[PDB]
Amino acid sequence: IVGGQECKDGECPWQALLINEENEGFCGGTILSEFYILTAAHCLYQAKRFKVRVGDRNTEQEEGGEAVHEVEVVIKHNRFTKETYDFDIAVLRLKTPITFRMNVAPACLPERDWAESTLMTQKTGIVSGFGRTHEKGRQSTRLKMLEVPYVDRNSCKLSSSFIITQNMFCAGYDTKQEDACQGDSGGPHVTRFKDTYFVTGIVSWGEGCARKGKYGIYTKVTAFLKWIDRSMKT
Amino acid sequence: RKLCSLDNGDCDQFCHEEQNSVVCSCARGYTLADNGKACIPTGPYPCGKQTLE
Numbered sequence: 001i002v003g004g005q006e007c008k009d010g011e012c013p014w015q016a017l018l019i020n021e022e023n024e025g026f027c028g029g030t031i032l033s034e035f036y037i038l039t040a041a042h043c044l045y046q047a048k049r050f051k052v053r054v055g056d057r058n059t060e061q062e063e064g065g066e067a068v069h070e071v072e073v074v075i076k077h078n079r080f081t082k083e084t085y086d087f088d089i090a091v092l093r094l095k096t097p098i099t100f101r102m103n104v105a106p107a108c109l110p111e112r113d114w115a116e117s118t119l120m121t122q123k124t125g126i127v128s129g130f131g132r133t134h135e136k137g138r139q140s141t142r143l144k145m146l147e148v149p150y151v152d153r154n155s156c157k158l159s160s161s162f163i164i165t166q167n168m169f170c171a172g173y174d175t176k177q178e179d180a181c182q183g184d185s186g187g188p189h190v191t192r193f194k195d196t197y198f199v200t201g202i203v204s205w206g207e208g209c210a211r212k213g214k215y216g217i218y219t220k221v222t223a224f225l226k227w228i229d230r231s232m233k234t
Numbered sequence: 235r236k237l238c239s240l241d242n243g244d245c246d247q248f249c250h251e252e253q254n255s256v257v258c259s260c261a262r263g264y265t266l267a268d269n270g271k272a273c274i275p276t277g278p279y280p281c282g283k284q285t286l287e
């Protein structure tokens with residue numbers, strides 16, 4: 001996350017981090033239930049063996065809420081493609097269930113029509129992660145969150161050098177220095193409505209991080225709700 | 235602005251329109267209250283809520 005603020009105690013409880021053999025985070029995820037994590041399909045080609053960590057806000061201290069979970073099944077969308085990052089979505093089933101507590105809780109899955117007419121028409125969403133703090137910087141040891149305005153679809157298309165499919169949406173700023181970055185991919189994009197937070201996107205890609213005239217591109221979760229429902233039953 | 239487009243039809247969460255009438259509903263893990271508008275958590279740590287203690 002470039003810019004933004006620290007997630008304070010209990011504020012980002014649905015955050016998950018995919019960690020490699022060296023115990024280092026390389027992608028984010030969203031807690032959907034005791035057994036399921038939502039992430040990006042492209043993230044699955046960034047490590048041979050990985051695990052999921054939850055309830056962590058500071059990677060350099062033991063806060064007491066941390067839990068590591070092994071992955072039992074990887075469910076990648078069969079239409080995903082590395083050329084365009086179209087269908088950039090995956091679901092992970094965990095070997096053991098997540099025990100909810102302080103800093104460990106799921107985000108709600110919305111219904112499609114209501115989310116598109118009501119959530120995606122709000123001014124902003126919230127993105128979060130332990131990714132780079134600037135395009136060429138190091139990864140954050142602190143979990144960060146950032147408010148990102150929804151961006152007009154036409155303007156977004158005009159700004160992009162790569163195709164924007166029906167499965168993607170844009171969020172962020174034209175010139176202001178705030179955006180998601182490398183390391184945040186796979187992470188949560190949520191929308192608040194009456195003090196309840198709903199999953200609206202997955203951190204997907206961008207031409208760098210926080211560049212002038214460029215926005216953050218997210219997988220459009222509302223297009224994949226039936227797919228997510230199926231994946232969570234098998 | 236009518237029904238669901240007028241302040242979410244007074245619903246806490248999901249709003250839909252059936253036969254010129256607002257019908258409210260809730261995310262998994264909540265139940266619709268007696269007033270047919272508010273959403274009540276069925277157990278501890280319900281989805282979408284920042285944790286307190």
Ligand SMILES: C[C@@H](C(=O)N1CCOCC1)N1CC[C@H](NS(=O)(=O)/C=C/c2ccc(Cl)cc2)C1=O
Pocket residue numbers: 082083084085162179180181182183185203204205206207208209215216217218
């Ligand atoms: C343009 C994009 C990219 O390479 N692709 C592959 C083909 O399909 C389209 C996307 N790029 C360029 C490099 C960049 N990598 S990154 O580590 O800087 C990711 C940053 C990022 C910024 C904002 C959001 Cl919301 C998500 C990721 C990248 O993805």
Ligand SMILES: [Ca+2]
Pocket residue numbers: 056057058059060061062063066
């Ligand atoms: Ca820690």
Ligand SMILES: [Mg+2]
Pocket residue numbers: 172173174175176210211212213214215
């Ligand atoms: Mg920009």
